[PDB]
Amino acid sequence: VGRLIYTAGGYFRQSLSYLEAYNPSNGSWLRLADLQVPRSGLAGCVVGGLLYAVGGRNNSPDGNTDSSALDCYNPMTNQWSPCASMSVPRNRIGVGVIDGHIYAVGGSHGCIHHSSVERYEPERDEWHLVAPMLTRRIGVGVAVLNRLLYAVGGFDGTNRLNSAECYYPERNEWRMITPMNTIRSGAGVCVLHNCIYAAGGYDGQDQLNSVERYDVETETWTFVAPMRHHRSALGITVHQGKIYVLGGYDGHTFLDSVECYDPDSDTWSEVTRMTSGRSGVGVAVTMEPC
Amino acid sequence: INVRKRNVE
Protein backbone atom coordinates (compact mmCIF):
# COMPACT_ATOMS: atom_id res chain seq x y z
CA VAL A 1 0.00 0.00 0.00
CA GLY A 2 2.50 2.75 1.20
CA ARG A 3 0.19 5.19 3.16
CA LEU A 4 1.58 7.95 5.51
CA ILE A 5 0.12 9.94 8.46
CA TYR A 6 0.17 13.63 7.43
CA THR A 7 0.22 16.32 10.14
CA ALA A 8 -0.48 19.90 8.99
CA GLY A 9 -0.06 23.12 11.04
CA GLY A 10 -0.62 23.23 14.81
CA TYR A 11 0.60 25.52 17.58
CA PHE A 12 3.80 26.13 19.60
CA ARG A 13 4.14 29.79 20.76
CA GLN A 14 2.32 30.70 17.48
CA SER A 15 0.42 28.92 14.64
CA LEU A 16 2.75 26.74 12.45
CA SER A 17 2.91 26.09 8.67
CA TYR A 18 4.57 22.62 9.04
CA LEU A 19 3.47 19.69 6.83
CA GLU A 20 5.25 16.47 7.94
CA ALA A 21 4.43 12.85 7.08
CA TYR A 22 5.09 9.80 9.33
CA ASN A 23 5.66 6.32 7.75
CA PRO A 24 4.46 3.58 10.19
CA SER A 25 6.38 0.95 8.07
CA ASN A 26 9.88 2.42 8.77
CA GLY A 27 9.43 5.11 11.51
CA SER A 28 10.67 7.95 9.14
CA TRP A 29 9.38 11.59 9.04
CA LEU A 30 9.39 13.66 5.76
CA ARG A 31 9.16 17.48 5.90
CA LEU A 32 6.95 18.51 2.88
CA ALA A 33 5.73 21.89 1.48
CA ASP A 34 4.71 24.44 4.21
CA LEU A 35 1.05 25.62 4.31
CA GLN A 36 0.67 28.98 2.43
CA VAL A 37 -0.74 30.48 5.73
CA PRO A 38 0.10 29.28 9.30
CA ARG A 39 -2.86 27.47 10.91
CA SER A 40 -3.84 25.88 14.19
CA GLY A 41 -7.23 24.57 15.38
CA LEU A 42 -7.70 23.30 11.77
CA ALA A 43 -8.87 19.81 10.73
CA GLY A 44 -7.36 17.57 8.05
CA CYS A 45 -9.06 15.04 5.72
CA VAL A 46 -8.45 13.15 2.46
CA VAL A 47 -10.73 12.88 -0.65
CA GLY A 48 -9.63 11.10 -3.87
CA GLY A 49 -5.96 10.92 -2.70
CA LEU A 50 -5.76 14.71 -1.88
CA LEU A 51 -5.10 16.16 1.62
CA TYR A 52 -7.39 19.05 2.68
CA ALA A 53 -6.64 21.57 5.46
CA VAL A 54 -9.88 23.17 6.71
CA GLY A 55 -10.45 26.23 8.94
CA GLY A 56 -8.38 26.93 12.09
CA ARG A 57 -6.79 30.34 12.71
CA ASN A 58 -3.44 32.15 12.39
CA ASN A 59 -2.52 32.91 16.08
CA SER A 60 0.60 35.13 15.42
CA PRO A 61 2.48 37.76 17.50
CA ASP A 62 0.66 40.60 15.59
CA GLY A 63 -2.80 38.94 15.04
CA ASN A 64 -5.45 36.23 15.66
CA THR A 65 -7.22 35.72 12.28
CA ASP A 66 -9.93 33.01 12.20
CA SER A 67 -9.74 30.99 8.91
CA SER A 68 -12.53 30.18 6.40
CA ALA A 69 -9.84 28.60 4.13
CA LEU A 70 -9.91 25.23 2.40
CA ASP A 71 -6.46 24.33 0.97
CA CYS A 72 -5.52 21.15 -0.94
CA TYR A 73 -2.08 19.34 -0.88
CA ASN A 74 -1.36 16.90 -3.77
CA PRO A 75 1.37 14.41 -2.70
CA MET A 76 2.22 13.87 -6.44
CA THR A 77 3.25 17.59 -6.85
CA ASN A 78 4.28 18.40 -3.22
CA GLN A 79 2.11 21.57 -3.79
CA TRP A 80 -0.77 23.33 -1.89
CA SER A 81 -3.66 24.88 -3.93
CA PRO A 82 -6.34 27.21 -2.51
CA CYS A 83 -9.94 25.93 -2.92
CA ALA A 84 -13.28 27.78 -2.38
CA SER A 85 -13.51 29.36 1.12
CA MET A 86 -16.25 28.35 3.61
CA SER A 87 -19.25 30.71 4.35
CA VAL A 88 -17.66 31.66 7.72
CA PRO A 89 -14.33 31.42 9.59
CA ARG A 90 -14.25 28.25 11.80
CA ASN A 91 -11.43 27.96 14.38
CA ARG A 92 -11.37 24.68 16.45
CA ILE A 93 -13.35 23.08 13.58
CA GLY A 94 -14.45 19.46 13.18
CA VAL A 95 -14.45 17.71 9.77
CA GLY A 96 -15.71 14.43 8.32
CA VAL A 97 -16.03 12.98 4.79
CA ILE A 98 -19.18 11.27 3.46
CA ASP A 99 -19.17 9.85 -0.10
CA GLY A 100 -16.37 12.20 -1.31
CA HIS A 101 -17.92 15.36 0.35
CA ILE A 102 -16.23 17.37 3.16
CA TYR A 103 -18.49 18.40 6.09
CA ALA A 104 -17.23 21.45 8.09
CA VAL A 105 -18.79 21.47 11.59
CA GLY A 106 -19.09 24.21 14.21
CA GLY A 107 -15.95 26.03 15.46
CA SER A 108 -15.36 29.69 16.60
CA HIS A 109 -15.16 33.14 14.98
CA GLY A 110 -14.05 35.59 17.69
CA CYS A 111 -16.71 35.21 20.50
CA ILE A 112 -19.16 33.46 18.05
CA HIS A 113 -19.69 29.67 18.70
CA HIS A 114 -21.16 28.07 15.48
CA SER A 115 -23.94 25.43 15.24
CA SER A 116 -23.70 25.85 11.42
CA VAL A 117 -22.48 23.01 9.13
CA GLU A 118 -21.44 23.19 5.47
CA ARG A 119 -20.58 20.61 2.79
CA TYR A 120 -17.87 20.89 0.10
CA GLU A 121 -18.10 19.31 -3.39
CA PRO A 122 -14.51 18.76 -4.67
CA GLU A 123 -15.40 18.44 -8.41
CA ARG A 124 -17.65 21.57 -8.43
CA ASP A 125 -15.28 23.37 -5.92
CA GLU A 126 -18.37 24.69 -4.01
CA TRP A 127 -19.51 24.91 -0.35
CA HIS A 128 -23.25 24.89 0.67
CA LEU A 129 -24.72 25.11 4.19
CA VAL A 130 -26.69 22.03 5.40
CA ALA A 131 -28.85 21.77 8.57
CA PRO A 132 -27.13 23.26 11.63
CA MET A 133 -26.37 21.11 14.68
CA LEU A 134 -28.84 21.15 17.61
CA THR A 135 -25.89 22.62 19.66
CA ARG A 136 -23.26 25.38 19.25
CA ARG A 137 -19.94 23.48 19.40
CA ILE A 138 -16.28 24.55 19.13
CA GLY A 139 -13.41 22.10 19.79
CA VAL A 140 -15.89 19.49 18.46
CA GLY A 141 -14.79 15.96 17.49
CA VAL A 142 -16.22 14.60 14.18
CA ALA A 143 -16.15 11.11 12.61
CA VAL A 144 -18.10 9.18 9.93
CA LEU A 145 -19.37 5.57 10.30
CA ASN A 146 -21.74 3.84 7.84
CA ARG A 147 -22.28 7.18 5.98
CA LEU A 148 -23.62 8.91 9.17
CA LEU A 149 -21.70 11.99 10.61
CA TYR A 150 -21.11 12.28 14.40
CA ALA A 151 -20.36 15.55 16.24
CA VAL A 152 -18.91 14.79 19.71
CA GLY A 153 -18.48 17.10 22.74
CA GLY A 154 -16.82 20.53 22.43
CA PHE A 155 -17.52 23.91 24.08
CA ASP A 156 -20.59 26.21 23.65
CA GLY A 157 -18.73 29.13 25.35
CA THR A 158 -20.47 28.45 28.72
CA ASN A 159 -20.02 24.64 29.26
CA ARG A 160 -17.61 21.94 28.03
CA LEU A 161 -20.00 19.26 26.57
CA ASN A 162 -20.46 15.47 27.05
CA SER A 163 -23.32 15.57 24.47
CA ALA A 164 -23.08 14.22 20.89
CA GLU A 165 -25.38 14.19 17.82
CA CYS A 166 -25.64 12.39 14.47
CA TYR A 167 -26.45 13.77 11.00
CA TYR A 168 -28.65 11.64 8.67
CA PRO A 169 -27.73 13.01 5.20
CA GLU A 170 -30.83 11.68 3.36
CA ARG A 171 -33.03 13.60 5.90
CA ASN A 172 -30.63 16.63 6.26
CA GLU A 173 -31.37 16.27 10.02
CA TRP A 174 -29.42 16.09 13.32
CA ARG A 175 -30.52 13.94 16.28
CA MET A 176 -28.97 13.68 19.76
CA ILE A 177 -27.23 10.36 20.62
CA THR A 178 -26.27 9.01 24.09
CA PRO A 179 -23.94 11.53 25.79
CA MET A 180 -20.36 10.49 26.64
CA ASN A 181 -19.51 9.51 30.24
CA THR A 182 -17.03 12.45 30.24
CA ILE A 183 -17.17 16.17 29.30
CA ARG A 184 -14.59 16.66 26.48
CA SER A 185 -13.53 19.74 24.52
CA GLY A 186 -10.78 19.34 21.89
CA ALA A 187 -10.85 15.51 22.09
CA GLY A 188 -9.56 13.29 19.26
CA VAL A 189 -12.58 11.62 17.61
CA CYS A 190 -12.26 8.85 15.01
CA VAL A 191 -13.96 5.60 13.92
CA LEU A 192 -12.55 2.07 14.36
CA HIS A 193 -14.61 -1.01 13.45
CA ASN A 194 -18.23 -0.28 14.50
CA CYS A 195 -17.38 2.36 17.20
CA ILE A 196 -16.78 6.13 17.48
CA TYR A 197 -13.81 6.79 19.82
CA ALA A 198 -13.31 9.99 21.86
CA ALA A 199 -9.73 10.18 23.21
CA GLY A 200 -8.48 12.83 25.69
CA GLY A 201 -9.63 16.45 25.48
CA TYR A 202 -10.22 18.97 28.32
CA ASP A 203 -13.10 18.73 30.88
CA GLY A 204 -12.72 22.36 32.20
CA GLN A 205 -10.32 21.20 35.03
CA ASP A 206 -7.73 18.77 33.55
CA GLN A 207 -6.39 17.45 30.22
CA LEU A 208 -7.75 13.87 29.95
CA ASN A 209 -6.03 10.53 29.20
CA SER A 210 -9.42 8.62 29.20
CA VAL A 211 -10.80 7.12 25.95
CA GLU A 212 -14.41 5.98 25.47
CA ARG A 213 -16.14 4.48 22.47
CA TYR A 214 -19.73 4.58 21.18
CA ASP A 215 -21.08 1.30 19.74
CA VAL A 216 -23.58 2.44 17.02
CA GLU A 217 -25.59 -0.84 17.39
CA THR A 218 -25.89 -0.72 21.25
CA GLU A 219 -25.93 3.15 21.67
CA THR A 220 -23.62 2.91 24.75
CA TRP A 221 -20.24 4.55 25.52
CA THR A 222 -17.65 2.31 27.23
CA PHE A 223 -14.19 3.37 28.47
CA VAL A 224 -11.23 1.51 26.92
CA ALA A 225 -7.56 1.59 28.11
CA PRO A 226 -6.45 5.21 28.80
CA MET A 227 -3.60 6.86 26.82
CA ARG A 228 -0.13 7.03 28.51
CA HIS A 229 -0.32 10.92 28.24
CA HIS A 230 -3.12 13.33 29.27
CA ARG A 231 -3.71 15.46 26.10
CA SER A 232 -6.06 18.15 24.75
CA ALA A 233 -5.95 19.59 21.20
CA LEU A 234 -4.52 16.24 19.92
CA GLY A 235 -4.51 15.06 16.31
CA ILE A 236 -6.07 11.62 15.66
CA THR A 237 -6.28 9.20 12.71
CA VAL A 238 -6.70 5.50 11.97
CA HIS A 239 -4.12 3.45 9.95
CA GLN A 240 -4.29 -0.37 9.36
CA GLY A 241 -6.83 -0.96 12.19
CA LYS A 242 -4.97 1.09 14.85
CA ILE A 243 -5.64 4.60 16.31
CA TYR A 244 -2.79 7.14 16.33
CA VAL A 245 -2.87 10.27 18.54
CA LEU A 246 -0.35 13.03 17.73
CA GLY A 247 0.80 15.80 20.10
CA GLY A 248 -1.51 18.12 22.07
CA TYR A 249 -1.13 19.69 25.54
CA ASP A 250 -0.92 17.96 29.02
CA GLY A 251 -1.18 21.16 31.16
CA HIS A 252 2.70 21.44 31.21
CA THR A 253 4.24 20.45 27.79
CA PHE A 254 3.36 20.74 24.06
CA LEU A 255 3.72 17.00 23.38
CA ASP A 256 5.79 15.52 20.55
CA SER A 257 4.41 12.12 21.78
CA VAL A 258 2.57 9.91 19.18
CA GLU A 259 0.73 6.89 20.75
CA CYS A 260 -0.93 3.95 18.93
CA TYR A 261 -4.01 2.03 20.20
CA ASP A 262 -4.33 -1.69 19.39
CA PRO A 263 -8.02 -2.64 19.81
CA ASP A 264 -7.12 -6.41 19.78
CA SER A 265 -5.01 -6.02 22.97
CA ASP A 266 -6.77 -2.83 24.32
CA THR A 267 -3.33 -1.23 24.83
CA TRP A 268 -1.55 2.01 23.88
CA SER A 269 2.17 2.19 23.02
CA GLU A 270 4.58 5.07 22.14
CA VAL A 271 5.50 4.58 18.43
CA THR A 272 7.47 7.79 17.51
CA ARG A 273 7.81 11.49 18.43
CA MET A 274 6.97 14.41 16.15
CA THR A 275 10.01 16.56 15.23
CA SER A 276 8.71 19.23 17.70
CA GLY A 277 5.96 19.48 20.35
CA ARG A 278 2.76 21.14 19.07
CA SER A 279 -1.06 21.18 19.63
CA GLY A 280 -4.10 21.89 17.33
CA VAL A 281 -2.80 19.96 14.24
CA GLY A 282 -4.83 18.64 11.30
CA VAL A 283 -4.12 14.94 10.53
CA ALA A 284 -5.18 12.48 7.80
CA VAL A 285 -3.87 9.42 5.86
CA THR A 286 -3.07 9.11 2.11
CA MET A 287 -0.45 7.85 -0.47
CA GLU A 288 3.23 8.89 -0.02
CA PRO A 289 4.52 11.86 -2.09
CA CYS A 290 6.00 10.88 -5.55
CA ILE B 1 -16.67 27.17 37.43
CA ASN B 2 -13.78 25.88 35.07
CA VAL B 3 -10.33 27.20 33.65
CA ARG B 4 -8.27 26.49 30.33
CA LYS B 5 -4.41 26.88 31.11
CA ARG B 6 -2.01 27.78 28.17
CA ASN B 7 -2.98 28.46 24.52
CA VAL B 8 -3.40 25.28 22.30
CA GLU B 9 -5.15 26.78 19.22
Q: What residue ranges define each of the domains in chain A, with the CATH number in brackets?
A: 3-287 (2.120.10.80)
The three-class DSSP label of residue A49 is coil
Question: Chain A closest CA to B7's CA: distance in Å?
Answer: 8
Per DSSP (E only), the strands in A43-147 are 43-47, 50-54, 57-59, 64-66, 70-74, 79-82, 94-98, 101-105, 108-109, 112-113, 117-121, 126-130, 141-145
- Within 10 Å of residue A22's Cβ, how many Cβ atoms? 26
Query: Are A233 and B5 in contact (CB < 8 Å)?
Result: no
Beta-bridge mates of residue A214: A196, A221
Q: Where are the alpha helices (DSSP H) in A19-80?
A: none
Q: How was this structure determined?
A: X-ray
Of B2, B7, B8, the CB nearest to A160: B2
Q: Which chain A residues contact residue B8 at CB under 8 A?
A: 11, 40, 186, 232-233, 248-249, 279-280
User: How far apart (Å, rounded) are the C-alpha atoms in residues A4 and A129?
Assistant: 31
